[PDB]
Ligand binder design. Structure first.
Ligand SMILES: O=C(O)[C@H](Cc1cnc[nH]1)n1cccc1
Length: 321
């Protein structure tokens, strides 16, 4: 089947994004940075390791549900088109493509991510594995290009791994409304959400003893050093995995050991950390089963299936327009 890659991000859309977020976030109280900057190539290789740590259940837990329920997903949604908000490199992507193909209905695949080079490699791979699938890959972001996803057929939009947990409730409803807004009736969304559980287990999942997560968190300082010509003393920031009980969310902070004075050249800006000051680099919202379905409803989607792993750790929702 034919490939297409359509690119809607400027050649430097990523750099200007990085300059804006760092400039704004290094000047607020407390300092905060978006988590999307974790995922350069070094960072992406660290995230590949996190998914295989014993402490980090979410990848395994979702995998278990999908290894069991992918057929039922394909049966209930009847889609001929799989749209992934994500790069399409997962094993779980092949689970869902397998289900639609086994159902005799796999006609089209639409990966939707921001790195065109990842999309082009994904399309090549999928096009070799699945004869007779059209791979319409889209390079864009959620804030402006969800309308660039192709029309027609019955579409299953997929957004796994509790990625939506990276969105606090304000931006989260703003995303679900936009997505449901581009969905046609008969389309359906598959959404993974990590569930509230024992806080001791939540905190260990985000601070593994060897510190693979610690390097992942600190890696944000390396990306800023390199792409904005800053001088973070990366070794003098400490990984801190916090449980925010009232918002029911994990938080990833960097605590500054000793007063730091960092200068980001490309921005012509100097920031200051007091000794022990902590910067927010991620939130990882955990969910309750009723609150997920209710939130889907606010956006105009009606959950028809909810699915849990054998242990109750992770939830997969299937909702229709
Ligand atoms: O929330 C998560 O556990 C991860 C990020 C992360 C893993 N360990 C520390 N941070 N994730 C998954 C989708 C989007 C972010």
């Amino acid at each position: 089947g034919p490939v297409s890659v359509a690119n809607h991000l400027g050649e430097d859309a990523g750099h200007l994004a990085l300059r804006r977020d760092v400039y704004s976030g290094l000047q607020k109280t407390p300092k905060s940075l978006p988590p999307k900057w974790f995922y350069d190539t070094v960072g992406s290789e660290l995230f590949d390791q996190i998914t295989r740590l014993p402490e980090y259940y979410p990848t395994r837990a979702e995998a278990e549900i999908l290894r069991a329920r992918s057929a039922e997903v394909a049966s209930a949604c009847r889609a001929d088109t799989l749209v992934e908000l994500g790069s399409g490199t997962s094993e779980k992507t092949r689970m869902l493509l397998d289900a639609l193909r086994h159902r005799g209905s796999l006609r089209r695949f639409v990966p939707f991510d921001v790195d065109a080079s990842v999309l082009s490699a994904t399309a090549t791979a999928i096009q070799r594995e699945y004869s007779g699938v059209e791979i319409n890959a889209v390079c864009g972001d959620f804030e402006e290009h969800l309308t660039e996803i192709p029309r027609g057929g019955r579409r299953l939009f997929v957004f796994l791994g509790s990625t939506i947990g990276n969105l606090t409730p304000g931006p989260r409803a703003q995303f679900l409304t936009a997505l449901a807004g581009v969905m046609r009736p008969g389309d359906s969304l598959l959404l993974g959400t990590d569930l509230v559980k024992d806080a001791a287990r939540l905190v260990r999942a985000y601070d593994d003893p060897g510190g693979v997560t610690a390097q992942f968190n600190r890696n944000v300082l390396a990306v800023i050093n390199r792409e904005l010509e800053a001088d973070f003393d990366v070794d003098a920031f400490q990984h801190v995995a916090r449980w925010n009980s009232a918002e029911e969310r994990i938080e990833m902070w960097l605590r500054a050991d000793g007063r730091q004075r960092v200068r980001v050249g490309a921005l012509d800006l100097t920031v200051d950390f007091d000794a022990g000051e902590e910067m927010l680099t991620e939130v990882s919202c955990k969910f309750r089963p009723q609150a997920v379905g209710a939130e889907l409803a606010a956006a105009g989607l009606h959950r028809i299936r909810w699915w849990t792993d054998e242990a109750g750790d992770f939830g997969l929702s299937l909702a229709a327009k």
